[PDB]
Ligand binder design. Structure first.
Ligand SMILES: C[As](C)(=O)[O-]
Ligand SMILES: [Zn+2]
Ligand SMILES: [Zn+2]
Ligand SMILES: [Zn+2]
Ligand SMILES: [Zn+2]
Ligand SMILES: [Zn+2]
Ligand SMILES: [Zn+2]
Length: 162
């Protein structure tokens, strides 16, 4: 097999999850207004982070091909996946539930080309095929650097269908 254009591929977008993001925002706020301490080991959402969602329209016979992360303005974004054991409806995200490594993408000033941490972005992507088997939905925390917001970002993952 030689890698080529005629391969069945599926592109699955990472969609902003407003209500989960809002739920997490509220959580940090409540903790302040009440002067309460966060849970032992909890991950509190920083204002620059937003929760994204990826719905595996197919879970079996998937092979990670590449990331399709694009910024329409110079900037930087970090995409950190979360454990497939974290069910947002049930618990507050734990720091240990953040997957290592994260995929970091950036666009420098006068160039239009994106660049990223190739080795880690690949390692992370390879994991998605197995994570899809655990459940149809997966959550991510996308950290936006200075100058960029969710509106500037278009992220998706491309899998070759086996
Ligand atoms: C925490 As929700 C209501 O985005 O499944
Ligand atoms: Zn070859
Ligand atoms: Zn939601
Ligand atoms: Zn839910
Ligand atoms: Zn590079
Ligand atoms: Zn590099
Ligand atoms: Zn690394």
């Amino acid at each position: 097999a030689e890698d080529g254009p005629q391969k069945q591929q599926l592109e699955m977008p990472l969609v902003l999850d407003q209500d989960l993001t809002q739920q997490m925002r509220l959580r940090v706020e409540s903790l302040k207004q009440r002067g309460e301490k966060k849970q032992d080991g909890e991950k509190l959402i920083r204002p620059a982070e937003s929760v994204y969602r990826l719905d595996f329209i197919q879970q079996q016979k998937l092979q990670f091909d590449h990331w399709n992360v694009v910024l329409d303005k110079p900037g930087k974004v970090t995409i950190t996946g979360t454990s497939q054991n974290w069910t947002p409806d049930l618990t507050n995200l734990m720091t240990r539930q953040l997957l290592d490594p994260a995929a970091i993408f950036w666009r420098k000033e006068d160039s239009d080309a994106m660049d990223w941490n190739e080795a880690d972005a690949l390692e992370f992507g390879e994991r998605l095929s197995d994570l899809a088997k655990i459940r149809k939905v997966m959550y991510f925390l996308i950290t936006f650097g200075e100058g960029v917001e969710p509106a500037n970002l278009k992220a998706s993952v491309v899998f070759n269908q086996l």
